[PDB]
Symmetry: C2
Subunit: 306 residues, 2 copies
């Protein structure tokens, strides 16, 4: 029993992290097979970041200007390419630790693990959600760019996120592994607005189900509700609206606990309109939205990976 | 910027996890060099757990009764030994992935990462604290026993915890890697009382300093206080008392932020006596005590490991 914000085991990713240096700037890269993926702003100095012309800047750089380092071994860059916002640095040797991997573009509200790295060296791992406004509330210091987010199917690592920027508001932005930003952000040091951040309702419901499974039942209320009437209240508290797809996704959790999804919605609705009155749920005084319904089933059923 | 409950990268540990089977029971083992460490109650059936005579039970078991499996390879048990509450299963092959390691007995209030495993296969990693009552509030399903907790010095893994038991209260108990339980617990399925759990005050102060560093300053109050007067209030709220050693440990955080330790104590004292009034600190509505002063400096300075 018990419930924790669990990250995926990071080993399969740790062996893919390299240090990329272009000029003075050094950040992290992802060494899969014979391509090193890293943020293209590695080619930028502090001045260039304010208004970078990446095509022009990249053209002033040559293969020999990129120093890729993995531990105390050096990789030779035999080719460089820019895909949207990622640099593809083709090196001469394929990473012998290359796991079975997938590149995926996740949707807001999905969770993944981040391996936070500095100088190509892992410092820690934590689980987070892609906010509905396509930011992440991470922990990234200077030099952590190129840190990646991932999910692990049993033997297959799904890379979904590469860190690029800390917005001036202190939240973090990045791309998928094809270099396409999540959200409306660009890799330039300018003020950039993230949209209104909403709470991921289906995740909160998932976590409520986890709370029931772990014995926290006090929020099971006397009421029920409709999906239309629930969404009316959720809109007021900046919760994303619930769809039938979300109900369908919560099906197994409803079956395991004997609590229909709309009955849990009535409990959540009451939690929103009346708060938690100095009480907790799974140790939290706030409603948690960084567990998907799949995270809950995974943790409550103990699925493992390679 | 930003702050997250970061776990250590788990790769160095993942390659040490094996599956141990004795009779019907299967749990996790730790394969270091040529010794597999696992909970001795692997030799127990469900009935034996209520009143196990481990010496007698172990004597009824032979080397060929222990099936150690790592992936799809089998390890041959060439010897078995019981050290306090751990079984030492000497196998014929030394783990080629054996990291530089240390066995350490940590003190209550210290943090470490747990690699939660089932059938010898990693399912997730999370950071936790050893409570002052020598329990841990983990996430362990059936078959997760033998999961280990660890810290990572740059290249050296310090194993500090092996999971053995979920207490009937749903909290978790285990041993160091020499088999000595943390706390007054025994590995038998009987009601076992954990002491009063207190909040780890020096950790809460560390996390306050992290909050200042990350821009959460509203709790910096108009007051100051003495170490004697602070401990008077902390005792009322089930906070462990603060020593000069704790003050000395917080020294660097005090230097970085320009806030004397006793001034932070006055802020914490006010937080205790008056609550947080529906406000948050680093995203939390509760005071967090699972970051040590070293965790904060580590995360705020971005120290890395092998």
């Amino acid at each position: 029993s018990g419930f924790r914000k669990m990250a995926f085991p990071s080993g399969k990713v740790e062996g893919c992290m390299v240090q990329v240096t272009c000029g003075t700037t050094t950040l992290n890269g992802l060494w899969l097979d014979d391509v090193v993926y890293c943020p293209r702003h590695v080619i930028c100095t502090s001045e260039d970041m304010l208004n970078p012309n990446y095509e022009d800047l990249l053209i002033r750089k040559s293969n020999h200007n990129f120093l890729v380092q993995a531990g105390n071994v050096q990789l030779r860059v035999i080719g460089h390419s820019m895909q949207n916002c990622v640099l593809k640095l083709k090196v001469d040797t394929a990473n012998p630790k290359t796991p079975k991997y997938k590149f995926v573009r996740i949707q807001p509200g999905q969770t993944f693990s981040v391996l936070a790295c500095y100088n190509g060296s892992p410092s820690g791992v934590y689980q987070c959600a892609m906010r509905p406004n396509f930011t992440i509330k991470g922990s990234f210091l200077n030099g952590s760019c190129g840190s990646v987010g991932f999910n692990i199917d049993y033997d297959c690592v799904s890379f979904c996120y590469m860190h690029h920027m800390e917005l001036p508001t202190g939240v973090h932005a990045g791309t998928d592994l094809e270099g396409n930003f999540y959200g409306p952000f660009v890799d330039r040091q300018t003020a950039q607005a993230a949209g209104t951040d909403t709470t991921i309702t289906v995740n909160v419901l998932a976590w409520l189900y986890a709370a029931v499974i772990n014995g926290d039942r006090w929020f099971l209320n006397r009421f029920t509700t409709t999906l239309n009437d629930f969404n009316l209240v959720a809109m007021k508290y900046n919760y994303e609206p619930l769809t039938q797809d979300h109900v369908d996704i919560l099906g197994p959790l409803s079956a395991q606990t004997g609590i229909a999804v709309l009955d849990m919605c009535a409990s959540l609705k009451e939690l929103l309109q009346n708060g938690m009155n100095g009480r907790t749920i799974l140790g939290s005084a706030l409603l948690e939205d960084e567990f998907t319904p799949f995270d809950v089933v995974r943790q409550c059923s103990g699925v493992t990976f390679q």
